Enzyme design. Structure first.
Site, PDB file in Angstrom:
ATOM      1  CD  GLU A 168      57.341  54.154  36.376  1.00 11.47           C
ATOM      2  OE1 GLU A 168      56.470  54.635  37.136  1.00 11.47           O
ATOM      3  OE2 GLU A 168      58.420  54.736  36.103  1.00 11.47           O
ATOM      4  CD  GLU A 171      62.738  55.993  31.892  1.00  5.15           C
ATOM      5  OE1 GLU A 171      62.765  56.620  33.000  1.00  5.15           O
ATOM      6  OE2 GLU A 171      61.666  55.622  31.367  1.00  5.15           O
TER       7      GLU A 171
END
Ligand SMILES: [Cl-]
Ligand SMILES: [Cl-]
Ligand SMILES: [Zn+2]
Ligand SMILES: [Zn+2]
Ligand SMILES: [Zn+2]
Ligand SMILES: [Zn+2]
Ligand SMILES: [Zn+2]
Ligand SMILES: [Zn+2]
Ligand SMILES: [Zn+2]
Length: 371
Positions: free
Chosen positions: A151, A257
């Site tokens: 991120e 994910e």
């Protein structure tokens, strides 16, 4: 197609074994659960830790390393012939705060003297290198795939202005990858993992970042696409564009994910699994059908598809499943409709192909077939 036990069902990894591995995210207690263990053994050939390999799980205080829980997942994976992904060496979420304190115990982000700021940068990069060194020296012969940074690009298309970036600038990303390569060697594979990788301006910012790092000789092998997605968004066309552009830079792509929420954003969830209408599962199945047809189409560019969980009785999406109630106490799921109160994180999402009773869902049949 019947709602049969998933322990009785055709193995998902075997259906995809020439296309990509099929993984699941786990917590150590699940390795003590008969049904979860049988699920892992039957359907999955890759594993990732939902939480016990995050920085605060591994080094919560400087010099205190807790590999016990991570070791349990590595042991299970090896015993069952599973690939392992490492989640994750660097992330702004839940940093152990000691990383960012100066020698006087004050927050490095408040330092204004330039010389001292430069000193803090070097201190932080050294702490970062030691964190990565210790983990990679332990697991380099066991773990093939690494989320080296997580991120690091913001939704606004600028680098995320976390303390990492504030204190050290773009160099913390370069140092993270260089340290992983230095201590783990050429055979571990190094990824930049992120969500909303399909969405502009984030997508192009991610693209420009990894292009730049590669031109400078920073070791990056792939992009992780978290793929926290919905039934309708993002479109398959935009997923395809995204995977293709990163592949054109010479990068591997992993779907790291995956979950297909029943809801929009911010979610207006049902309070319970039993309240979710049957038609939602059919809609979800159609989405999974299209998604996995696409992943197969691009299988020469995708090495792994990992679900962020095993079956619908356990999913981090429940933390986002806010339940809205009107003045009379009825549940509200229409995003534009009146409501009086919300119970945050108290509802139920249903993101996988396996239901909470470990029986296969319509989405399972949609991706196990060859249509
Ligand atoms: Cl969770
Ligand atoms: Cl069910
Ligand atoms: Zn298998
Ligand atoms: Zn119930
Ligand atoms: Zn139920
Ligand atoms: Zn492949
Ligand atoms: Zn969990
Ligand atoms: Zn059921
Ligand atoms: Zn299908």
């Amino acid at each position: 197609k019947p709602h049969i036990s998933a322990l009785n069902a055709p193995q998902l990894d075997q259906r995809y074994k020439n296309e990509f591995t099929i993984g699941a995210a786990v917590e150590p207690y699940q390795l003590q659960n008969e049904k979860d263990v049988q699920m892992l053994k039957r359907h999955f050939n890759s594993i990732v830790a939902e939480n016990v390999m995050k920085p605060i799980s591994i080094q919560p205080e400087e010099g205190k390393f807790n590999f016990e829980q991570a070791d349990r997942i590595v042991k299970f994976a090896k015993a069952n012939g599973m690939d392992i992904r490492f989640h994750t060496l660097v992330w702004h979420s839940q940093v152990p705060q000691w990383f960012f304190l100066d020698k006087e115990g004050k927050p490095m982000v408040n330092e204004t003297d330039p010389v001292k700021r430069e000193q803090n940068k070097q201190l932080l990069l050294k702490r970062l290198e030691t964190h990565i060194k210790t983990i990679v020296e332990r697991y380099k012969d066991d773990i093939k795939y690494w989320d080296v940074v997580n991120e690091v690009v913001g939704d606004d298309g600028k680098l995320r202005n976390s303390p990492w970036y504030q204190i050290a600038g773009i160099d913390y990303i370069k140092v993270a990858f260089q340290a992983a390569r230095k201590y783990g060697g050429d055979n571990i594979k190094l990824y930049m993992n992120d969500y909303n990788t399909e969405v502009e301006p984030k997508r192009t910012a991610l693209y420009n970042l990894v292009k730049q790092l590669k031109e400078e000789g920073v070791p990056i092998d792939g992009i992780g696409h978290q793929s926290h997605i919905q039934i309708g968004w993002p479109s398959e066309a935009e997923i395809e564009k995204t995977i293709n552009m990163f592949a054109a830079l010479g990068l591997d792509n992993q779907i790291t994910e995956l979950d297909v929420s029943m809801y929009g954003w911010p979610p207006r969830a049902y309070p319970t699994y039993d309240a979710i209408p049957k038609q939602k599962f059919l809609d979800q199945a159609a989405r999974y059908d299209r998604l996995f047809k696409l992943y197969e189409k691009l299988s020469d560019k995708i090495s792994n598809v990992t679900f962020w969980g095993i079956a619908d009785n356990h999913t981090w999406l429940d933390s986002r499943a806010d339940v809205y109630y009107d003045a009379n106490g009825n549940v509200v799921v229409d995003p534009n409709a009146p409501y009086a109160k919300v119970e945050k994180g108290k509802g139920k999402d249903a993101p996988f192909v396996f239901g909470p009773d470990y029986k296969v869902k319509p989405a399972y049949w949609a991706i196990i077939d060859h249509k």
